């Protein structure tokens, strides 16, 4: 995306991070960005 590219890669999705080193596949809070572009963040602001 042209408007705010650095926010749509660092962070990416509207689901917040919870990353624990003890767990291998960390699916706590954040769902893994698929696809990483404008996507669900643009639809939640209405765009």
């Amino acid at each position: 995306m042209d408007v705010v590219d650095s926010l749509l890669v660092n962070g990416s999705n509207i689901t917040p991070p919870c990353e624990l080193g003890l767990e291998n596949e960390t699916l706590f809070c954040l769902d893994q960005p698929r696809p990483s572009k404008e996507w669900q963040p643009a639809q939640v602001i209405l765009l």
């Binding site: 696809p35 996507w39 669900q40 639809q43 209405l46």
Partner: peptide
């Protein structure tokens, strides 16, 4: 689909 909820 993500572009789909409001595709307009």
């Amino acid at each position: 689909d993500y572009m789909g909820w409001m595709d307009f």
